[PDB]
Subunit: 306 residues, 3 copies
């Protein structure tokens, strides 16, 4: 059992400074030792340095840093593809969530039947035509879903991307802040999700049962876990750019990670949006980073019963 | 869909200064825009100024401000009655919970088959003969329930009140601090309630299902939601006069409000007992008021999924 | 209905100073008045002073204060036995969890068919051959279980102890920090437990149902509740020596206690590991002690509905 750890310090998917220090904060919270102790063989790729693009002007006077996000994702995809081909489960540390464009593309390159569990307060499925922010970290899923491509225009620096998964192959968990055009998209393409409300109704156990039945109920598939730290309640994960009240509890987050581990199918994991600079204190930053480590470790077999 | 907003800054239902600033606090937290965004057509009656009563002596050397509370409610009932008769769902902002005497009386004046969902840490059903505090905010249900009336003496300033709710038409959610004579009343009159213990057992989904079966299971009825902010855990709503540990989570409160909205029957709502002065800090005051706005917005259609 | 309250200010079952002040903190938080209010007839034994042992050297260069813990427990067992024989339900305030060796031995002396509910973040079932800390508060169950006696060496000061519980007669609730030898022990002897994970899945109501089915499903037995304050999440019980994130909520703790009371079979209760010195503020110390009084009171009949 081998795990590749990749630092992807990207910030250009949004506008708030500091998310680029996420990977370092997560490492400092003891990630590598935690994974080693579970018996993971580790390759640390370090923090990547992405090639910048000069004069990376607004696309359509709205989408910010499109070429930089495109190129950095192209490079990240390469590293992820290569690491999966060498037999590593891939852990990518963010960084803002636009890097899932790169990790999922790289992952799907030779694992085209992968499925995605997207744990997040947000759906991240705005297209360039629906986003009201221009921030690519709120759009990553739109570039990945094949049913959507007639609705997704061609961004400078994005041409290397080819929609790799079907809308039946991603399930959301934790939703609570969804833009109206994203609601439309989720309903219109019948994309399955479990909002905080569904968790309130069903309980996290049934949510995971139904998630897996939908994705791997009839066949084994490599799992991509894309975990936005803002899925957790802001009291637990304050150091993040877009906190939304009413999130997952600590126990809920661990249970999700546990069930991910229990499938035996986890092939890649994104842990994104930890921004240590947004914490009002050092303790707030460290608790967020510690929580990130707990998720990753539980995803690779750390249990609550020894 | 039309909504009337009425500020009722009453404090004389109890002894702690500051609850009369509840309405201003809730408005400052952005109530009106939130309602507008949902598509509510809004009529703001502003904050009412209630007529004072000279020489409003204790009743029976115990009950404080009887005539002031009586008259203020009479005046409040008039405003509520008029707004509901003009087609408005009526939102009343408190103020202590004694104002439910006026809002429920006024609501019933136009919609006599109304039922009541009472969300509260407390039962508020003491009578003038059982109260150990003398505070009218802990007695309002006693003046409203038909079955209790031969046990409720006539208070100065209360003679205009016609008890308008049968004991089978009110359901409590959130109970955890109930005086022994209130417990006797609840059992003797077979009044239904879901205490925090019941919520622990059933979960909030089943609690709402059963609440609606009891109230509107046989026929459609207009719903009065009387929501005491102290129903929420003190950690979430610190700025209130009688906090009690072990209350509703944020998610539970939202789920209650959502199910209220989903019936299509909400006709009036009280949001009471927000006291900004009892906050330890301005942060605690704003989070309590923000929570109040979330309850109201959710009750009129705000969802956690877009 | 008679309750004996025994202060057991012991600290030598572990290495952190201050847990010996647990009983006083709990008394200061109003324990006696709370029990009286429920109709408990009270005998206060005050805080016991345990006989010290000179030159109490490490056993096997690892196990700390063995003779001191052995002797204090022998003395405590005598007091508990006498109180139980005199017809008292026995409340023992700690002090570290090694005192359960004494309370359970004393209790079993007159009620040999007793069963045990162990509420705790930890399993406390290391033996002198498996412990990595050397701290006896993490081993008390090992001295009590009949099935383990062939794997438990004889310690100085421990010779009076006669294992009195079968492995089918103890249930754990709340586990989340279990050493690998303890996990082996639990599975190997088929000791039943409900980890935090089980609680996330089942809900606390189902957990208590199954707990009682296992222990008293066939016959009525006197119940010993051994409650380590660290079962609660550290946000609620911060003043304790070995806190572990992701614990019981307030409501879960009350629910557990309420069910214990509802059996009518509660015969003895330990409330251990309150260490007021580990609080970073007096408020933190007080809320922990307040929480301890809530558990005890609820175990003897305090309700959330009056
Ligand atoms: N839907 C958002 C989501 C941002 C969070 C991205 B993440 O990776 O962290 O989940 C936010 C849209 N929102 C619309 C209302 C405005 O007031 C603020 C931006 C967007 O920018 O598209
Ligand atoms: N039962 C109470 C209710 C207070 C809360 C009113 B509300 O609108 O906020 O729900 C409190 C009675 N309690 C009796 C014990 C005394 O120590 C304190 C007051 C009362 O004053 O009648
Ligand atoms: N298993 C522990 C239990 C301590 C808590 C006892 B209690 O009464 O409070 O439940 C802890 C073992 N742990 C092993 C890893 C070390 O780094 C820390 C101690 C032990 O010391 O044996
Ligand atoms: Mn995201
Ligand atoms: Mn997000
Ligand atoms: Mn109340
Ligand atoms: Mn009230
Ligand atoms: Mn213990
Ligand atoms: Mn413990």
């Amino acid at each position: 059992h081998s795990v590749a750890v990749i630092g992807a310090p990207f910030s250009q998917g949004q506008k708030r400074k500091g998310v680029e220090h996420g990977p370092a904060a997560i490492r400092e919270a003891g990630l590598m030792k935690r994974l080693s102790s579970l018996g993971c063989h580790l390759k640390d790729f370090g923090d990547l340095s992405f090639t910048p693009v000069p004069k990376d002007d607004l696309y359509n006077n709205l989408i910010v840093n499109p070429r930089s996000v495109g190129l950095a994702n192209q490079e990240l995809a390469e590293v992820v593809s290569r690491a999966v081909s060498d037999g590593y489960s891939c852990v990518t540390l963010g960084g803002d969530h636009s890097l899932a464009i790169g990790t999922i593309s790289g992952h799907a390159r030779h694992c085209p039947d992968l499925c995605v569990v997207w744990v997040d307060a947000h759906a991240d499925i705005n297209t360039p035509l629906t986003t009201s922010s221009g921030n690519l970290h709120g759009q990553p899923v739109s570039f990945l879903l094949r049913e959507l491509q007639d609705k997704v225009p061609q961004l400078p620096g994005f041409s290397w991307i080819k929609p790799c998964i079907s809308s039946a192959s991603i399930v959301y968990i934790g939703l609570r802040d969804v833009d109206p055009p994203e609601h439309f998209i989720l309903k219109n393409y019948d994309i399955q999700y479990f909002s905080m409300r569904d968790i309130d109704r069903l309980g996290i156990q049934k949510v995971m049962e139904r998630t897996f039945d939908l994705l791997i109920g009839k066949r084994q598939r490599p799992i991509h876990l894309s975990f936005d730290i803002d899925a957790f309640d802001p009291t637990l994960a304050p150091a993040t750019g877009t906190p939304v009240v009413g999130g997952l509890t600590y126990r809920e987050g661990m249970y999700i990670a546990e069930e991910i581990h229990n499938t035996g199918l986890l092939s890649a994991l994104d842990l994104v949006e930890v921004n240590p600079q947004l914490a009002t204190s050092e303790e707030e930053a460290k608790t967020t980073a510690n929580l990130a480590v707990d998720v990753i470790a539980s995803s690779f077999g750390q249990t609550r019963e020894g």
